[PDB]
From Swiss-Prot, chain A:
The keyword Ribosomal protein applies. The gene is RPL3. Gene3D superfamilies: 3.30.1430.10, Ribosomal protein L3, domain 3 (4.10.960.10), Translation factors (2.40.30.10). This is Large ribosomal subunit protein uL3. It comes from Saccharomyces cerevisiae (strain ATCC 204508 / S288c). One of its GO terms (molecular function) is RNA binding. The modification Phosphothreonine is found at residue 102.
Curated annotation (Swiss-Prot), chain B:
Component of the large ribosomal subunit (LSU). Mature yeast ribosomes consist of a small (40S) and a large (60S) subunit. The 40S small subunit contains 1 molecule of ribosomal RNA (18S rRNA) and 33 different proteins (encoded by 57 genes). The large 60S subunit contains 3 rRNA molecules (25S, 5.8S and 5S rRNA) and 46 different proteins (encoded by 81 genes). uL22 is associated with the polypeptide exit tunnel. The lineage of its organism: Eukaryota, Fungi, Dikarya, Ascomycota, Saccharomycotina. There is a cross-link at residue 45 (Glycyl lysine isopeptide (Lys-Gly) (interchain with G-Cter in ubiquitin)). One of its GO terms (biological process) is cytoplasmic translation. Belongs to the universal ribosomal protein uL22 family. This is Large ribosomal subunit protein uL22A. Component of the ribosome, a large ribonucleoprotein complex responsible for the synthesis of proteins in the cell. The small ribosomal subunit (SSU) binds messenger RNAs (mRNAs) and translates the encoded message by selecting cognate aminoacyl-transfer RNA (tRNA) molecules. The large subunit (LSU) contains the ribosomal catalytic site termed the peptidyl transferase center (PTC), which catalyzes the formation of peptide bonds, thereby polymerizing the amino acids delivered by tRNAs into a polypeptide chain.
Swiss-Prot record, chain C:
The gene is RPL19A. Disulfide bonds: none annotated. Present with 97700 molecules/cell in log phase SD medium. Component of the ribosome, a large ribonucleoprotein complex responsible for the synthesis of proteins in the cell. The small ribosomal subunit (SSU) binds messenger RNAs (mRNAs) and translates the encoded message by selecting cognate aminoacyl-transfer RNA (tRNA) molecules. The large subunit (LSU) contains the ribosomal catalytic site termed the peptidyl transferase center (PTC), which catalyzes the formation of peptide bonds, thereby polymerizing the amino acids delivered by tRNAs into a polypeptide chain. There is a cross-link at residues 20, 52, 59 (Glycyl lysine isopeptide (Lys-Gly) (interchain with G-Cter in ubiquitin)). The modification Phosphoserine is found at residues 29, 36. It is found in: Cytoplasm. Component of the large ribosomal subunit (LSU). Mature yeast ribosomes consist of a small (40S) and a large (60S) subunit. The 40S small subunit contains 1 molecule of ribosomal RNA (18S rRNA) and 33 different proteins (encoded by 57 genes). The large 60S subunit contains 3 rRNA molecules (25S, 5.8S and 5S rRNA) and 46 different proteins (encoded by 81 genes). eL19 lies in close proximity to the binding site for eukaryotic initiation factor eIF4G. This is Large ribosomal subunit protein eL19A.
Swiss-Prot record, chain D:
Its main location: cytoplasm. This is Large ribosomal subunit protein eL31A. The keyword Iron does not apply. The lineage of its organism: Eukaryota, Fungi, Dikarya, Ascomycota, Saccharomycotina. PROSITE patterns: RIBOSOMAL_L31E. It is found in: Cytoplasm. Component of the large ribosomal subunit (LSU). Mature yeast ribosomes consist of a small (40S) and a large (60S) subunit. The 40S small subunit contains 1 molecule of ribosomal RNA (18S rRNA) and 33 different proteins (encoded by 57 genes). The large 60S subunit contains 3 rRNA molecules (25S, 5.8S and 5S rRNA) and 46 different proteins (encoded by 81 genes). The gene is RPL31A. GO terms for molecular function: structural constituent of ribosome.
RNA sequence: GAAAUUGUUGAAAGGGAAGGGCAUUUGAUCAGACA
RNA sequence: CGUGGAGGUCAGUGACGAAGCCUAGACCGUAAGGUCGGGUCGAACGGCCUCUAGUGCAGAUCUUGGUGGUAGUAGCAAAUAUUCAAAUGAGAACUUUGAAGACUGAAGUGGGGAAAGGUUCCACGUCAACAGCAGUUGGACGUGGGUUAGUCGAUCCUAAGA
RNA sequence: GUGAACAGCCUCUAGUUGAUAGAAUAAUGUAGAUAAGGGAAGUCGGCAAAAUAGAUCCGUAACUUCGGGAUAAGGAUUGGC
């Protein structure tokens, strides 16, 4: 008859269905617009969400009440050992849209990738790619003409890369393989780069720089079957109400005589694909680098790994991307980081940060000490020890 | 005797019954059907495993609002269950057939079950008390079970009709010249 | 094997509650033949059925 | 083949019981132990000494000690022949504290 | 020892009911007339 | 057109198979229906002219009986709680015994009675039904045994009342 | 035993351990609890819920049929040795 009072609907209809995703690895649905005047490099990267901590930095923003004053800010850390290049795939344009034409593969393939191609690895004869590997033998003939044919046709080129999941504290030995569009100039220059990087390795620093705005593509945490109140942020019904109250009182008018797509119902919650954007990179780590977690002002040699280690993850012994704030997906999940799709000007983007101090105390309680050293200092001598 | 339609040669088959068994008609229907046509030997090892919850029985008719299980994938099915009491009654009949086969002098290694048929025994009446002074039937749904084991025999040779061919005057003018013309 | 009767009889004969009669699990065939009071009697007197002690409710803390 | 062994294990009951309803903690423990014997002895058949039972129920249902020092013994089966020729007896070991011991083989004869 | 209703076996059809009417293909099945 | 029963008749059919029942086999009739074959069955039954009626069903929230879909579904969630081992038995989550853990907490889940029941008591045997899982157990089933009074009640007396 | 107590709570004697069971711990429930800052803004309505409570001492208004109102209200205090 007409609402009575007016309110916004609940929740966004541009995120339906609120279904479990088809895969733990959320898909890159879009790559940066290509400028072929620049050198060749990846346009994304693979890693694993390890955890969060706190940061202190002076903020630089003429006009704000916190100009040249410190702020304290949340950051996530994703574990990011070098990705390894094992294939090139070339796409061509058709009136039916983009279509994959060939894939060329490297000759040798890590067991790490090799075992993604399997479901019962232990029992198997592991024959994956063994006839392919032979194609090199014969001078090279066939792999050439394929590379060669990518070159001739092909509107875009992506690289087949995979993570070195063993360089990571995780249990799962089976790595993550994935296509990354390649944007540096010229089709042929692209596939050469790809050909050149077969079996060889690619670093993060060649993909991201400090203060870059990047996007995170990941599968959201799971929560299972969810009632309507938490899933859609619906009003709790009154305490007096029969047969339950975390519900919707009116699931619909009498006509249309059908529950409609647009009304909140109980169902799966989380495990969704998201493409979260505009996460500025506060740090690019270095695994071989002691004093990862140190700064210009801190100096105290220590790595980013909190005392006792990242809760529910492990240690971070590889290079990492420290990104301001928080990110979709949870600890241990594969996560794609993507080059931004637009040159943002913002001032917020553009501000070149410089960390003053990275927090490094335990996360497994009310952590009181940055380092065993500090703890040793403050506590004195204990009944164990020397 | 007088079992349901069979097509098997009784000289190489043995058979068994239960009548008025207090097992669920519907569950044992599903398990009977699950064993049907099987190698008698593969069938027994199979029922054993059901009892162990290592493989299951696909429910295919009497199965609405049944549970779901990985153990149906074997059979292309999502709903499968593990009907204990059915299985033990069925395998008991099977054990019987075995014994009779042995007695007829039949080769056990060739025994498959070539007929297994459950249908509905007379119901058994018990009753329950519902709200407001009421009473309702509360009923057993029992089963008769019959199976037949038969020795596998291979091949079938050939042999059949001849269809007496019949064709017009002009239909053999072509033919009579088809060969006089060519080969 | 079913010693209820012998147990109840045991309780009655000894003069205390069943909760405290001990039926010796190794003379379980001997006990079973004990159908009568006279033969529970001389089963009690030779340790095949023992009285089983009271449960202390001490007064020490009260005191 | 077989192997016929005795060892003495400590089992963490605390993480196995963490969460479980109070009225099910002693019962759960009986079970979880059985399970523990099968995981080590290979053996579907697991039997608990009536004194072991006592050790478990020593403090009431919900009061199960966080660690137990067991002695698990693999033995051969007897009479009417069960499915499998092996089985395990479990006994409590009279130890001063269950806390602190590695798993040890008992040299039997 | 009918029917409702059921099991098995054989045959057939089935993209949000089924069943029906005129007509013919196809499959199965069968009467008659011929001499 | 069809059904129960009656008079007449065809010296009608039939244990060498009446009647009935089954049959996407045949044939006659526009139709109500009629005829045959084959299977099943077992003792009676039909055509024709007439006579006679308790004479034809889809319904009546029809009567009685039987049967479904629903559905292996709702459910079997109040009364704090169970556990190890032996014994027995085809069979043991549930019986027996031992051990342990608890409960009722003397305003009792203790020890007796009145009304009412009527053998439920007790023993031996024992599981087809019953005890909304089970069963080797039972207030179940089978076969037996058992209730002792000068003093305990009745019986006597009177009450409202009859 | 505690305590004013035949209360509640724990125990001895006696008696039970009966009441389908197993595995999990989604939604929504039923029953039991908690919640920062605000404090009835919720709602027909404080419905529900929360707050209060024993004892000892101190203190106690209008009004009244002088019997009350009254544990009015408002306060302090309480273990062990
Ligand atoms: Mg409006
Ligand atoms: Mg899917
Ligand atoms: Mg090609
Ligand atoms: Mg919730
Ligand atoms: Mg909200
Ligand atoms: Mg939220
Ligand atoms: Mg209400
Ligand atoms: Mg609402
Ligand atoms: Mg923490
Ligand atoms: Mg029959
Ligand atoms: Mg059905
Ligand atoms: Mg059905
Ligand atoms: Mg279901
Ligand atoms: Mg359901
Ligand atoms: Mg459904
Ligand atoms: Mg599972
Ligand atoms: Mg299915
Ligand atoms: Mg009911
Ligand atoms: Mg009821
Ligand atoms: Mg009533
Ligand atoms: Mg011809
Ligand atoms: Mg010709
Ligand atoms: Mg919990
Ligand atoms: Mg008959
Ligand atoms: Mg037609
Ligand atoms: Mg007429
Ligand atoms: Mg007539
Ligand atoms: Mg009549
Ligand atoms: Mg004819
Ligand atoms: Mg005939
Ligand atoms: Mg006939
Ligand atoms: Mg006769
Ligand atoms: Mg007439
Ligand atoms: Mg009439
Ligand atoms: Mg009609
Ligand atoms: Mg009718
Ligand atoms: Mg009708
Ligand atoms: Mg009509
Ligand atoms: Mg009717
Ligand atoms: Mg009816
Ligand atoms: Mg059932
Ligand atoms: Mg159910
Ligand atoms: Mg309950
Ligand atoms: Mg209920
Ligand atoms: Mg029980
Ligand atoms: Mg108590
Ligand atoms: Mg009391
Ligand atoms: Mg009782
Ligand atoms: Mg009495
Ligand atoms: Mg009575
Ligand atoms: Mg009795
Ligand atoms: Mg029985
Ligand atoms: Mg009864
Ligand atoms: Mg029952
Ligand atoms: Mg029974
Ligand atoms: Mg009797
Ligand atoms: Mg009698
Ligand atoms: Mg007297
Ligand atoms: Mg007298
Ligand atoms: Mg009693
Ligand atoms: Mg109940
Ligand atoms: Mg349950
Ligand atoms: Mg609050
Ligand atoms: Mg206030
Ligand atoms: Mg208001
Ligand atoms: Mg106010
Ligand atoms: Mg209002
Ligand atoms: Mg009002
Ligand atoms: Mg109002
Ligand atoms: Mg109230
Ligand atoms: Mg409070
Ligand atoms: Mg007042
Ligand atoms: Mg004091």
């Amino acid at each position: 008859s007409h609402r009575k009072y007016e309110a916004p609907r609940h929740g966004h209809l541009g995120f339906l269905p609120r279904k479990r995703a088809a895969s733990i690895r959320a898909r890159v649905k879009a790559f940066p617009k290509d400028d072929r005047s620049k050198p060749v490099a990846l346009t994304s990267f693979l890693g694993y969400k390890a955890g969060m901590t706190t940061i202190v930095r002076d903020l630089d923003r003429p006009g704000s009440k916190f100009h040249k004053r410190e702020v304290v800010e949340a950051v996530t850390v994703v574990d990011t050992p070098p990705v390894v290049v094992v294939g090139v795939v070339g796409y061509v344009e058709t009136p039916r849209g983009l279509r994959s034409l060939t894939t060329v593969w490297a000759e040798h393939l890590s067991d790490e990738v090799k075992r993604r191609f399997y479901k019962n690895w232990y029992k198997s004869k592991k024959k994956a790619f063994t006839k392919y590997s032979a194609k090199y033998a014969q001078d090279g003939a066939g792999i050439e003409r394929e590379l060669a044919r990518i070159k001739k046709y092909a509107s875009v080129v992506r690289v087949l890369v995979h993570t070195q999941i063993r360089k990571t504290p995780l249990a799962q030995k089976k790595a993550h393989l994935a296509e990354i569009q390649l944007n540096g100039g010229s089709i042929s220059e692209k596939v050469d780069w790809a050909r050149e990087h077969f079996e060889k390795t690619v670093a993060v620093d060649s993909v991201f720089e400090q203060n870059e705005m990047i996007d995170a593509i990941a599968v959201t945490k799971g929560h299972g079957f969810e009632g309507v109140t938490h899933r859609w942020g619906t009003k709790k019904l009154p305490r007096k109400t029969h047969r339950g109250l975390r519900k919707v009182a009116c699931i619909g008018a009498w006509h249309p005589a059908h529950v409609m797509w647009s009304v909140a119902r109980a169902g799966q919650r989380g495990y969704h694909s998201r493409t979260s954007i505009n996460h500025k990179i506060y740090r690019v780590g270095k695994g071989d680098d002691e004093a990862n977690g140190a700064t210009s002002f801190d100096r105290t040699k220590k790595t980013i790994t909190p005392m006792g280690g990242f809760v529910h993850y492990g240690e971070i012994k590889n290079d990492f991307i420290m990104v301001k704030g928080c990110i979709p997906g949870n600890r241990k999940r594969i996560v794609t980081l993507r080059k931004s799709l637009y040159t943002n000007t913002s001032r917020k983007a553009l501000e070149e940060v410089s960390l003053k101090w990275i927090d490094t105390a335990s996360k497994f309680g009310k952590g009181r000490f940055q380092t065993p050293a500090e703890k040793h200092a403050f506590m004195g001598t204990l009944k164990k020890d020397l | 005797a007088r079992y349901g339609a069979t097509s098997t040669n009784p000289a190489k088959s043995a058979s068994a019954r239960g009548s008025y068994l207090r097992v669920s008609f519907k569950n044992t229907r599903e398990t009977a059907q699950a064993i049907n046509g099987w190698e008698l030997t593969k069938a027994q090892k199979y029922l054993e495993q059901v009892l162990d919850h290592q493989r299951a029985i696909p429910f295919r008719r009497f199965n609405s609002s049944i549970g779901r299980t990985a153990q149906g994938k074997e059979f292309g099915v999502t709903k499968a269950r593990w009907p204990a009491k059915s299985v033990k009654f069925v395998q008991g009949l099977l054990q019987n057939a075995a014994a009779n086969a042995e007695a007829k002098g039949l080769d056990a290694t060739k025994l498959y079950v070539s007929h297994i048929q459950v249908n509905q025994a007379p119901k058994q009446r018990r009753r329950t008390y519902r709200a407001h002074g009421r009473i309702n039937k509360y009923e057993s749904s029992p089963s008769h079970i019959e199976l037949v084991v038969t020795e596998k025999e291979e091949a079938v040779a050939k042999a059949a009709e001849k269809k007496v061919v019949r064709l017009t005057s002009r239909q053999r003018g072509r033919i009579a010249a088809q060969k006089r013309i060519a080969a | 094997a079913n010693l209820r009767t012998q147990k109840r009889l045991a309780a009655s004969v000894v003069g205390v509650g069943k909760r405290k009669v001990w039926l010796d699990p190794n003379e379980t065939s001997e006990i079973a033949q004990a159908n009568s009071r006279n033969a529970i009697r001389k089963l009690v007197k030779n340790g095949t059925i023992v009285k089983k002690a009271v449960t202390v409710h001490s007064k020490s803390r009260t005191r | 083949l077989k192997d016929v062994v005795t060892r003495e294990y400590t089992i963490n009951l605390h993480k196995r019981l963490h969460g479980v309803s109070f009225k099910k903690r002693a019962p759960r423990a009986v079970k979880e132990i059985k399970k523990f014997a099968k995981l080590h002895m290979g053996t579907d058949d697991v039997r608990l000494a009536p004194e072991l039972n006592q050790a478990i129920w020593k403090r009431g249902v919900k009061g199960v000690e966080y660690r137990l020092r067991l002695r698990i013994s693999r033995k051969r089966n007897e009479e009417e022949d069960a499915k499998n020729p092996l089985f395990s007896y479990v006994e409590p070991v009279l130890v001063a504290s269950a806390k602190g011991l590695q798993t040890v083989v008992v040299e039997e004869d």
